């Protein structure tokens, strides 16, 4: 998070940390808890890595340096990457992670409400992006969970900023003309939440940007509302009703 501030215990209780355990354990991505057994994250977090054994999910945590071998974590039972996602490309950057065990809800560990498919037409006004990513371009992983207030930009206004790519109706962009406030590497897969009608809703999944916080270069997010039919279909038990 570039241009952000420290967050408090219980402020973003849905935020999780996706870490890989290879030669050393490192935070790679953010994610949002959406159910007792489900986390929503970006498909690009899994590029060049197996879906099995190497992942650990941390929830109910504010500072990354507090994580030791004693800290309880969630393991992956299944990873569902969008069928149309292509490794190293931008479209459909979304994945669901099914946990091996359900997580009990506390005031520090609870899900973020999902929008409806019809909520695509809604223009939000109080949006925040959180994570432990780089505090500046080419920077380093932050210890304390950062937060930042970022306004949304129209898809047409976002398309003009990225004329070498195609900003689809399945993406939502957020930034300031002067830059200085944006998500960065390590924030990927985390939440872009908006407060609407008194309650918090998951609007975007942090995906990409040309660098971080550059002027007139807004952050691109996977628009959750455009994937609600997919999330609902994929979270069904598999064994059937």
Ligand X SMILES: *[C@@H]1O[C@H](CO)[C@@H](O)[C@H](O)[C@H]1NC(C)=O
Site residues for ligand X per CB under 6 A: 5-6, 144
- C-alpha–C-alpha distance, residues 43 and 88, integer Å: 10
- From 7, 188, 196, 207, the catalytic residue: 188
Q: How far is the CB of 8 from ligand X (least distance, A)?
A: 11
Evaluate whether 204 touches 174 at the Cβ level (below 8 Å).
yes
- From 59, 93, 135, 182, the catalytic residue: 93
Evaluate whether 57 touches 136 at the Cβ level (below 8 Å).
no
**Between 6 and 154, whose beta carbon lies closer to ligand X?**
6
| Alpha carbon distances (Å) from 73 to 19, 47, 112, 149 | 10, 22, 19, 29
**Between 145 and 224, whose beta carbon lies closer to ligand X?**
145
**SS3 call for 67:** coil
Q: How far is the CB of 6 from ligand X (least distance, A)?
A: 4
- C-alpha–C-alpha distance, residues 204 and 193, integer Å: 7
Q: How many CA atoms lie within 13 A of 105 on its CB side?
A: 10
Residue 202: strand pairing partners: 193
**SS3 call for 195:** strand
Q: Residue 238 catalytic? A: no
**Between 5 and 113, whose beta carbon lies closer to ligand X?**
5
**Between 6 and 116, whose beta carbon lies closer to ligand X?**
6
Which residue in the shown chain puts its C-beta closest to ligand X? 6
**Between 6 and 25, whose beta carbon lies closer to ligand X?**
6
- From 44, 82, 92, 196, the catalytic residue: 44
Residue 155: strand pairing partners: none
Q: How far is the CB of 1 from ligand X (least distance, A)?
A: 11
Q: Residue 188 catalytic? A: yes
Q: Residue 44 catalytic? A: yes
Q: How many CA atoms lie within 13 A of 29 on its CB side?
A: 28
- C-alpha–C-alpha distance, residues 93 and 170, integer Å: 10
Q: How far is the CB of 18 from ligand X (least distance, A)?
A: 22
Catalytic residues: 44, 93, 188
């Amino acid at each position: 998070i570039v241009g952000g501030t420290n967050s408090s215990w219980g402020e973003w209780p849905w935020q999780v940390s996706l870490q890989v355990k290879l030669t050393a354990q490192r935070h790679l991505c953010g994610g949002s808890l959406i159910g007792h057994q489900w986390v929503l994250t970006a498909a690009h977090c899994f590029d060049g890595l197996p879906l099995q054994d190497v992942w650990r999910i941390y929830s109910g945590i504010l500072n990354l340096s507090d994580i030791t071998k004693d800290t309880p974590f969630s393991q992956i039972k299944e990873i569902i990457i969008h069928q149309n996602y292509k490794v190293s490309e931008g479209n459909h950057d979304i994945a669901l992670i099914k946990l091996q065990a359900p997580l009990n809800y506390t005031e520090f560990q609870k899900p973020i409400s999902l929008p409806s498919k019809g909520d695509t037409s809604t223009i939000y006004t109080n949006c925040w992006v959180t994570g432990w990513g780089f505090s500046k371009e080419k920077g380093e992983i932050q210890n304390i969970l950062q937060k930042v207030n970022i306004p949304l930009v129209t898809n047409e206004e976002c398309q003009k900023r990225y004329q070498d790519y195609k900003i689809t109706q399945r993406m939502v962009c957020a930034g300031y003309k002067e830059g200085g406030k944006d998500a960065c590497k390590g924030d990927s897969g985390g939440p872009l939440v908006c407060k609407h009608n008194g309650m918090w809703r998951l609007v975007g999944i942090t995906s990409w940007g040309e660098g971080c916080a550059r002027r007139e270069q807004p952050g691109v997010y996977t628009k959750v509302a455009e994937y609600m039919d997919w999330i609902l279909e994929k979270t069904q038990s598999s064994d059937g009703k």
